[PDB]
Design a protein around this ligand. Sequence first.
Ligand code: SF4
Lengths: 53, 61, 732, 206
Amino acid sequence: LRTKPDPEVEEQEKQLTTDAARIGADAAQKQIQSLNKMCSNLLEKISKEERES
Amino acid sequence: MVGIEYILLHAQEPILFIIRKQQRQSPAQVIPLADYYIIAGVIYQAPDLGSVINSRVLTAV
Amino acid sequence: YFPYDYIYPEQFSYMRELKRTLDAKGHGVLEMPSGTGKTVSLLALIMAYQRAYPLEVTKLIYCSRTVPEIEKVIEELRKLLNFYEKQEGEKLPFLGLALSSRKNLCIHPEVTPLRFGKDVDGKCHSLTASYVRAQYQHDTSLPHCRFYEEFDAHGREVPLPAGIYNLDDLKALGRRQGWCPYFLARYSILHANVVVYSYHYLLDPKIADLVSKELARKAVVVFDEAHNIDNVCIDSMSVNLTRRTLDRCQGNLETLQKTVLRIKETDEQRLRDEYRRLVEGLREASAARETDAHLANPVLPDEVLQEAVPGSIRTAEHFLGFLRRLLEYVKWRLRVQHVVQESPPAFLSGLAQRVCIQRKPLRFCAERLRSLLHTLEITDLADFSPLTLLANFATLVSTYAKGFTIIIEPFDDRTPTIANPILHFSCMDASLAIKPVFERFQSVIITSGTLSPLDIYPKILDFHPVTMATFTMTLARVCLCPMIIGRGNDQVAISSKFETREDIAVIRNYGNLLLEMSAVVPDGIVAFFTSYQYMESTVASWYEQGILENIQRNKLLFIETQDGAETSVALEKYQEACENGRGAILLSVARGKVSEGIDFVHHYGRAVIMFGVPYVYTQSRILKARLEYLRDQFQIRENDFLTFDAMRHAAQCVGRAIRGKTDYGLMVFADKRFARGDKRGKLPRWIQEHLTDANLNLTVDEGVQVAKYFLRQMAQPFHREDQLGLSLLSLE
Amino acid sequence: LRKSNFRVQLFEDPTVDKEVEIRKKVLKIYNKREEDFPSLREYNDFLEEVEEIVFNLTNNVDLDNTKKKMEIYQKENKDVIQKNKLKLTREQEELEEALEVERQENEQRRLFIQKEEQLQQILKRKNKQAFLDELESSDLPVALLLAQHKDRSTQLEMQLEKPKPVKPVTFSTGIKMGQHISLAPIHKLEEALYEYQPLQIETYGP
Ligand code: SF4
């Protein structure tokens, strides 16, 4: 019954926290929205192109 | 006086002594917060069935 | 204030009973001996309270259970009206309204002599407020409802009637001035000062017969012989449903559709003007005499039917809701006929799977059943009567089911096959039948001459400030002879242990204990059997084996029929066949409805023989939910009321022949269950001086000489029996 | 018949084709309509809108693609499905617990009847056997009647007692603390930060 992970993953998590310290709040929301819209558009184009038979 | 009352839950005479943290709204009303278990005079906090599994899957993968 | 002579020191025993239950607003329970004028006791102080206004207000509603005794209430109070009238000088105004609605109805010789009540009143109301409300003007179709037209003219007029009338008064006055019982009564309820009617009529949850305005300021209501309230209230909300009904209903399903199809806009735009008014501002349009003709309120203690026009917007759509209902209801019937199932709120839940929109169209249906016929105003009521049954039902299933009980009874009861299955919706809380009664009333007094355990008012599950035990003395020599038999020779087995058809060796000596009762006791006897097939079992050995061979030779016998028509016949005989040179012992059933409305007199009927424990023994599993709920109320009640239910019917039946206080009564007890039960059930005034003074296991052959010793002495000149003159304290 | 379309229903009148078709289509599509308008009913007009289209399909009007192509295009089908997912998860959780409390209580009731049967019986069977061994070889100071009256009076007041002993429900404190099950809370007070302000300054001066 342990939970705390090894120092490797903990170091990765500290790097993730520094990354969180960069882009944040308004910038983070804009980035999330842009990524979702662009990914949806790409998937839609791919599906339409496949629709041919 | 009802509130934060750490109370022993289960006890084995030599080593095992489990403690529970309760928050009472009124007499005969108990809300369990957490569980701290003492093994061999060493106190640990009881891991959630799910936080433990999340960390476990993360390390393996 | 009518003491009027020696009143057998009782009005003073009931004087403070009023003054405690009324001045302090006491709810109140009275013991009363059967040997006491049920009103000469009560109304003499009640009508004294009518004159003695307290702060201001004294209403009177009264009810009892039989319409002849209803008039018998009226009968001598007219002299009580006249009594102090001469004494107090002038005569003040009064009204007592016998309102037996469904009984006496139309003078018209065409409408009148068709036998039943409800159907013929449907012909009456179809003529008045369905034919002459739809076809207003006309000559032939209008016919001649002059008495209602006379009432309409008299509504503008303000007459003042005389005193309290009867149901034969308005009948002769129908050709004279009376405008018929239904409306002259509506105008007299406007200023009524005393109402007497049936215990049943108030307690109609199906059509909520709101008698007064709901005015609980001082609502003053009086109750006599209020014994079988459950057998009123649960049966008042009990809903029977025939398969033959449903198929007839299935047949007038599309029958009514043809009326819908033939009517394109004539009655349909009549709906369209007012169904819009249903959406805009809610008001009943059938609120003339059609409010009492239609289901007034199936579930009375509710707030309001606010969002009417339920999940149903059109009429065939609403008709489809019953197609969604009935056709599913036989699907909720026909497969269910293999297993009796007692699941009241689980049914409506599984219905919610099957019915698309529920719990509003379940409750908002029976008016929209009626109102979509009200834009028609076509269908005859007896035709439409098995349908109004159905929209009553799911309405009741909609509202009050978690406290109440659904029971499905397909199997053998007069059907040897499954040829007529049935289910029933019973309620269980007669409290919740009488809680709205109590909230509408002030504090109102039960009086039951049978009620010995006061513990059964919490079977009504209620509160009581005044509940005592009425004790009267007997300087009339000896009121009666209660005689517990317990034969040792023929070895008493009078409770149905080996049941009414398990052995006839039990039955070998009920004749012997009767014939000797017949041989000794003259002057007419009315005995009480348990049921009709019991009665049929009772005389079953009596013909083929030699029984009547002296019984017809001593007195004669009056069989009471399952059919009430032939049952009323011997009656015509028994009042006659006693008063001529014949004793002519009548034979009857306790639980059967031959046991009310009589008040046997010393003239004819002066002895009663017990036969068995007078309990139910018949209806399966109506017990268990009723059982367990009082076990959810008081938890040791299996043993308890299942004694008293027999007992509350016993002296209801048995304690009837003695009136006044000298009228005699030989109420013997052929019974095997007597040890506590008969003793608990007999009145505390009646166990004390009389029951088993030193006479318990009284073999009939020995008990022969008892009644001999009883009567012969008691038929000596009665020089004086508890004569009261002036007031000499005595202090009980 | 398209693909041998047949549907068995056990009742007196399943012959109503209009009614069977009505029930299937109306239940599926209009239960989502019940989670669209009656879910937040303005008054009665929201369930009246549902009933308008309910009738508009039962008559074989074949004006349905007109409404099927405007069926969920104005609102969110996931918001529809999730309330269907809400209510079905609600009702199945609702029905099973209703089925359990009617299964548990009466069975607990009849066992409480059953143990009280076992209570009164062997009590009566033993206290008269103890009375037997007490009636003989006994001191009985004053007369041979004494404690044998004493025991003949103590045993009737016992009949009431020991009702709690008959039923103990295994254990829910030492054996295991997972017997709680029926959990509840929903507590509120809303009373904090009262009379912090210190400004009571009064004057009739500069
Ligand atoms: S109203 Fe009066 S008269 Fe007209 S039908 Fe009913 S009774 Fe017959």
